[PDB]
Swiss-Prot record, chain A:
InterPro entries, sorted: Hexapep, LbH_gamma_CA-like, Transf_Hexapept/Carb_Anhydrase, Trimer_LpxA-like_sf
PANTHER family listed in its UniProt record: DYNACTIN SUBUNIT P25, PROTEIN YRDA
Superkingdom to which the source organism belongs: Bacteria
Protein name: Protein YrdA
Pfam family membership, one: Hexapep
GO MF entries: identical protein binding; zinc ion binding
Family per similarity comment: Belongs to the gamma-class carbonic anhydrase family.
From Swiss-Prot, chain B:
Family to which the UniProt record says this protein belongs: Belongs to the gamma-class carbonic anhydrase family.
PANTHER family: DYNACTIN SUBUNIT P25, PROTEIN YRDA
Pfam families, per database record: Hexapep (PF00132)
CDD domains: LbH_gamma_CA_like
Name the record gives this protein: Protein YrdA
GO cellular component, one term: protein-containing complex
One GO molecular-function entry: zinc ion binding
Protein encoded by which gene: yrdA
Length: 176, 170, 174
């Protein structure tokens, strides 16, 4: 179906979690409560784990992976996502770390080692370089991304609103 | 199966429409005649509707959605939507070619007879003048299209129409 | 399980120890050499022309592979090649031991020579030739510098790792 194993590892699911039947979730993947996985999304936590916080939405066509533990990269790079996170359509997340209340614009690519602090907004089609740290409360855009400006109080609030909205849209589908 | 409902909203399909079994069409999605939806495509018309004109092709990997809660998705006729194209709450005229891998954001407006180079990013609320070539991330007006090119736009739609009628048969 | 689809009279040619995720779509004249690994939600369409993928080459999750439209040109990928996540390949040619950075787009007629590295999210324009032994980055790509010996070695290690990971999935299945 949608949940697949890798070695002895199997996805750990929370409450009210949605995972479209057209998506694929493999290995050590943890989905906290109210997480919604939309259509044609792939989350492969095989060579390392993928942890996703509560009320976080992974939108249509997104792709999530990690990097294996190697010689110069003994720790490898697992994928960690906080709560109230909005991951846009066709986003590419790879071995990075995302705090809480963050919005990753559709079409963006976040590479290994990148760290996105809380209350951050990333413009669509952006590219976040490896080991790039995004300072909290700002808006970044571009390929490679550049810090554009602080977020308005409205925009910060929008981060929470965005997540909630998706939690709701998620529930409407579970209700069908 | 391939057509999913969003409460009381269900896709409306015209004549000779092609939808791959691997693609997902949800909610108020309106497909005119000869529209061809290709492999692994997702079209979501929940919070708002999605309307796609006649003889339009949505190639492999595209993702079509509307403006989150504020703007429906409208695509004209003879429109060629390249592979892995991202269209979000925008408005596309007739005889338009959206280069594969492009991203068109909320409120963007593409007039008729326009060509968008592959891998482009059309920012939010941006309008593209008819008869021009736009390329880049964010796109820039490159130059005007020759009559020959403006013609090639219609021929692309035509070719893909035959292309989808072929999959429908053999 | 129905990943293999035909197109007219053309049908996929599969080699040895080849993996194709059940969520992926392979259509028409697609030829997969030994140890090739087709990952989740990938689409490979060899209808108006064929697709040839050399041995030990990996096509990562969400990639889109197609050939040139009539107006063609087949898609040819060498051996020990590493095609990154969500990469778009279209009527181009890739030599042996090449790593295509995730999110990149390679257009019609592009020719990538052996031992090459393309940065993530790059765009290779039509008929563009990528010279052997270099790193290319950007949209559109620019020749940055020669790959070091370690980097070249890295190309082989990458293909090797994906061949193993592929077999682990083949193991869990069978
Ligand atoms: Zn990866
Ligand atoms: Zn959307
Ligand atoms: Zn194509």
């Amino acid at each position: 179906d949608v949940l697949h194993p890798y070695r002895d590892l199997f996805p750990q699911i929370g409450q009210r979690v949605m995972i479209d039947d057209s998506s694929v979730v493999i290995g050590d993947v943890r989905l906290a409560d109210d997480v919604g996985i939309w259509p044609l999304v792939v989350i492969r936590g095989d060579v390392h784990y993928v942890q996703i916080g509560a009320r976080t939405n992974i939108q249509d066509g997104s792709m999530l992976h990690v990097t294996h533990k190697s010689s110069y990269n003994p720790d490898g790079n697992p994928l960690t996502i906080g709560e109230d996170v909005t991951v846009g359509h066709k986003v590419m997340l790879h071995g990075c770390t995302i705090g809480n209340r963050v919005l990753v614009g559709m079409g963006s690519i976040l590479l290994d080692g990148a760290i996105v602090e809380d209350d951050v907004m990333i413009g669509a089609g952006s590219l976040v370089p490896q080991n790039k740290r995004l300072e909290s409360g700002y808006l970044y855009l571009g390929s490679p991304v550049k810090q554009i400006r602080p977020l308005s109080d409205e925009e910060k609030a929008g981060l929470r609103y965005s997540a909630n909205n998706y939690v709701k849209w998620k529930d409407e589908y579970l209700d069908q």
